[PDB]
Design a protein around this ligand. Sequence first.
Ligand SMILES: COc1ccc([C@H]2CNC(=O)C2)cc1OC1CCCC1
Ligand SMILES: [Mg+2]
Ligand SMILES: [Zn+2]
Length: 323
Amino acid sequence: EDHLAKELEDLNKWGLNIFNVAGYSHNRPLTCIMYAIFQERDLLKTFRISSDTFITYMMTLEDHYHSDVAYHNSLHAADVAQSTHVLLSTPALDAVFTDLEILAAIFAAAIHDVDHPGVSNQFLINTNSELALMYNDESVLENHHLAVGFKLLQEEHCDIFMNLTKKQRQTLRKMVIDMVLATDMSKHMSLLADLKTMVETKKVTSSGVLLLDNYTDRIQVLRNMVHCADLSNPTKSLELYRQWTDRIMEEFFQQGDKERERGMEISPMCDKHTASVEKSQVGFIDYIVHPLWETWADLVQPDAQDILDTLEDNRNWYQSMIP
Ligand SMILES: COc1ccc([C@H]2CNC(=O)C2)cc1OC1CCCC1
Ligand SMILES: [Mg+2]
Ligand SMILES: [Zn+2]
């Protein structure tokens, strides 16, 4: 109550604690943070989005995340949205994005895992699920989250974009699709290689502010930004990181139990009888998270040096828990 307002004082910081905001908002973290973010940035006024309309959409979207899924519930969406809100303010990216691109990136973060069933694209494909038949095995979940999110906008009592122009709605839809499809982990290596080429030919104004000429370059940075926000758990304080680790392992091990029940091969990091939680996090940091943030740090230096220091410290803690 007064605790919620104290926690939200850190709305614009990496140290914000989304678990605390959840506790004080009737477990509506996503509705809560999305509303705090939009007010802070004056987006409701800029795009003449009604408050009732915005709240009804957000509450419906949030009720569409599954509360019995350990990691991919509404708290993860809320976290990715809050993280993207901070990354958009990085000094190196100052005045680089339009208001429509800022709106799109934050909206993408919010809907980006909606209706997640708690199993991976590969699981959905090997069990011949209806979702995989629908999407022909390509970015199964991601196409689905986009579909639900944009579906809910089709209803007057819920169209938060009704006061944008047709032209603006089209551009936003293109940008959002692009950004959510980029959260598909099987696209990670591709995305990182492209981000490394963008750093290679990085250009800044006289005062260290990125120069982004075309739409192409702007959406490439936005794509990568949402993807970093998705893979930001290890760059947060150790206390936060460990609760996120606990949740993803719970979810991955539940998938492993379903794999065993059906006589399918068990995905090794989903096998609770053999997988080391600690080794898996160190591997995840060394091979995926660090390589990504090291590159993001290059693009916006020295803005993300503390984020990298926290990461390297967290990496060493998981390492020390391994005998
Ligand atoms: C907190 O950790 C993790 C946080 C987030 C993810 C995303 C990528 N895959 C997912 O399904 C979501 C994986 C994590 O750890 C997994 C890889 C290493 C062990 C588990
Ligand atoms: Mg996802
Ligand atoms: Zn996600």
